[PDB]
């Protein structure tokens, strides 16, 4: 228990985030684009695995996918880049602790979400260019997954987005509470294993699901309207999980009253 | 060997726990709610695994479940939050060592148990909201497990609770005896793998098994009366394991006499 | 750093006898914990053994070896007293004139009996869970306890030698590093090797026999068979830990 | 975030590389040959795995190959040797940051690529001498892979080269951002898993694919022309991924404006 | 870098080895016996695994064996004991760097090789005494492997020995280049996985394969002449990999060009 010091670090991180954005939109957006791309890389890997194992009829598909997703947030944390979903916890705890304003929070949320999407778009374009989703099990895995995501009821997506960002943000929280980089990566691995395999939903990961499916001329299951519907529901859920649960929660634990 | 140093750390932790509760019930209960939910997240994952592998008739089911439970206690330790089962050893050692009273101990046990339950209930509600236990093998795995859990004889549940909390508290004990966060997680991973795969029972984990079964309209196998029966039996077993083995044991090892 | 390592072994031996001389209760409680922690590893890998044997898997013994690390990891991380590690520590310390032959036999006897107490307590409580009432796990304990008790003395003895070379070398590694993670990894590798290769650990066997004798489910064991196995394996363990690891580390480290 | 410190570290590493080369072509080329060989060693392992599992008809082939390739970059990083693909990010960031010139960069690129190729040639010769690709599934895996790699469309290989070197360079970037050797190896393990299993292309790894295929008297439909074609397309993609994405991006993050 | 400091550590390690040997033949040979035994322990495990999975028809056999061999060199490195194959790189680098003589090197190589053999012999006898290779698939795996190893052409064995000791010595090299014991062990795990699964040959591991064959009554069919032939070809390959690739390689990386005080890199 060093909840107070932890809240101090979250607050200092929120302050530094808005300071960076005020200093340089380009640096901020570039950082955000990296993080979106790094998360998408995890999606490329586990959807390749999904295609390979689904084709085979394996019962381990979802387990292997969850075990293999760690790289997504590991890369974000180890490169120090800006991820929308972690910003839900960091900005809300900072705002509650009076380090940043509500306008700082919406600004960081908006720019990091958009920058993240830019990363996912760039990745999607390059991945299609590889020819790796022209035809076959990986293309089909993207196609079928994107369509099921776009047709899932709003309540289901919302609540899955809540549980997802509790796991993502708590993995970010762990990284603020240890000085061991290996422990950070292990905690990320566990949290991402839990969230992927349990069936929870990450807004930024989903950007790459849709970017690949939409840019691919051979994937014809989904549509931009579908992408928006899914992303809105999941983003809202992520926000509630990261800001209302983790942000508020860590403020309560840490605030010297 | 460092047994005295270890007892001194346990004693300090006990003192700090009761001081926290006395200072702020809200901070104490929020921490307890977090721990209950973090442990439940482990349940959500391994029961999803349960449902996936049982439906497939796999012999590795229980082994993969044990291997995948580590997140539950790893989150608790890395976030510094309040878990009832760990408090059995810490408060008992601290009490024997005259750092805290019997009343402090009973108070910490009651508040952390109830707070853990709040966390489990909240998690259950949100998990049911995902639509992930509407129907299918995961819902069925919850429903079948919850039914067999509340129909097991008291004595079997009690003894399963003892062995479970020897393992949970010894992994907490290890965390008091190393400065390496990675060693802490590895020891937690081993102990949780042992207790889940061997078939031991954790009261706080069971809260989430029962919260999901209670909230899901598709799960109609267990009853409030049965959940209560299981929880009492297992809580009592956990208490004997944590306080009478680990608490008393570590006091005996460390006390300068 | 062989000299420094021998000094650490010698200091550890001196601390063990000083502890036993100061408090039999503290010493036996530490030993009981260690016996119970090793036994917890057996409950886990025999559960695994029951599950996979039932499935006719070819990976049974490999998964069992990979999954046993907790046994010595707990002992090392809790600083508790394990008979088998004491075979190397006390012999190195005795050769190096930190402790006496009589101190060594005394530590060996107390830690062996303390470990046994931990195994018995564990066996009783595990039987109480109802988890070996019937089914593949109960059958795996019963069948393993039976085959262990019928193996020829010489086979058990040599298996005990190789087992304690591996257990004591993992303890030796723990004296040679300041990294707790490295300690656990080396323990994991050594227990993997010894379990999967089919070697025998006296203290682990105490839990095998405590479960088997406390479970009312019918086996072909008997107390005579259990004692037979424990004696043969204990003797092999002593040779592996004291004559190989203890003498060897003394030779490497002694400033002559 | 420590983006400025990181950019400074990249720049210092670029200055060190060109100073090394200017000091001794022998030392520089020997270092480069080692790295080419270390990478190639990863190829021998995973192609042996490819052969064994492909022969068996396993659906896990590409997954186990990805999991098993970590040694390639782990050796390079832990030995401090010169790898062409890593040099794409490092020299470009250092050049942008005015620590080295464009001429230095192209010189480092040329020497490290040729040096890496020398190490791949030596490895291939020696591996063929073992008799391990005289015949059988491993020999056939080399022969069929080499052939399919050489007949892939230019654009496909190019985009595959881009995504590969984003992953290789970001794992190198991680090594500059932590002091933990274990964390370095873990991130490398993750990045190499992702790039191999997803199907992306590494110029230096391909040098060993082709050295083995061409030196082995057991017959394929490859040819020197096919090898060069593949190596050029993939090298160009690696340069873009390493220099235009990672080099430029890390410069933008770290540059004080 | 840091090649110069790595060369210094190699050189100092070479100096300490010959000093130890000069000081006490008994200490040096006991250290070597330990290392031979520790490596052999890796063999007993992975040949047990070999027997289990071969009998079962698994295609994962050689992969699982490679994954499970890490203990062999991890024990050597974590106990600080004397392994012939590692000494190929260490003594050659230190020799090139003028810390030890050619005679020091040949001596360390001779004593460590024989010492390693002693440990493998002791291990083989004790392992046969367990009765674990009286009959069955593990017995057959040891026996079949021993026979096939003794009948492989010299050139194949030689080249396999080169690649193996590049891997073993590079893992020893990583251990000089880090202060993290866990990193040392991970690099050892990766290098041994690569060398075992790829099919490369280790002289000291082969000593235990043959010692188990020597003492197992359930047939040898192999021949002392055959074992010797295998051991010589693989030992020579190992020497080339460790000394000519790794030893000379690390000397070249590490030696500061001023000196010149004899010779000229360019
Ligand atoms: C590639 C260019 C990306 C530009 C993304 C800009 C997104 C702006 O987003 C807006 O930012 C405002 C603060 O300026 C906030 O007040 C608004 O809530 C928010 O919608
Ligand atoms: C949601 C509100 C939760 C409040 C839980 C308080 C329950 C207290 O419960 C009681 O606490 C006493 C000390 O105060 C102890 O002595 C008793 O053993 C315990 O039953
Ligand atoms: C629970 C009670 C267990 C007590 C175990 C005591 C076993 C004593 O054991 C004996 O101790 C003597 C010194 O006291 C030594 O001289 C002997 O070598 C040793 O066998
Ligand atoms: C034995 C191997 C020797 C390889 C030496 C390669 C020399 C490369 O030299 C470099 O080539 C670049 C393009 O290739 C040019 O842009 C540089 O001007 C030139 O210095």
Strand runs of chain A, count: 0
**C-alpha-based Rg of chain A, rounded:** 18 Å
Number of domains of chain A: 1
- Secondary structure class of chain A reads mainly alpha
Largest sheet of chain A: none
What is the CATH superfamily label of chain A? Answer: Glycerol uptake facilitator protein
* Pattern of helices and strands of chain A: HHHHHHHHHHH
Each distinct ligand: octyl beta-D-glucopyranoside
CATH class of chain A: Mainly Alpha
Helix percentage range of chain A: over 70%
**CATH A-level architecture of chain A:** Up-down Bundle
Strand content bin of chain A: under 5%
**Count of discrete alpha- or pi-helical segments spanning 4 or more residues of chain A:** 11
Q: Largest contact between protein chains?
A: D-E, 43 and 43 residues
Oligomer: homopentamer
Categorize the overall geometry of chain A. Answer: globular
Distance between the termini of chain A: 16 Å
- What name does the CATH topology of chain A carry? Glycerol uptake facilitator protein
Subcellular location (chains A, B, D): Membrane
Membrane topology (chains A, B, D): Multi-pass membrane protein
GO cellular component, one term (chains A, B, D): plasma membrane
GO molecular function, one term (chains A, B, D): metal ion binding
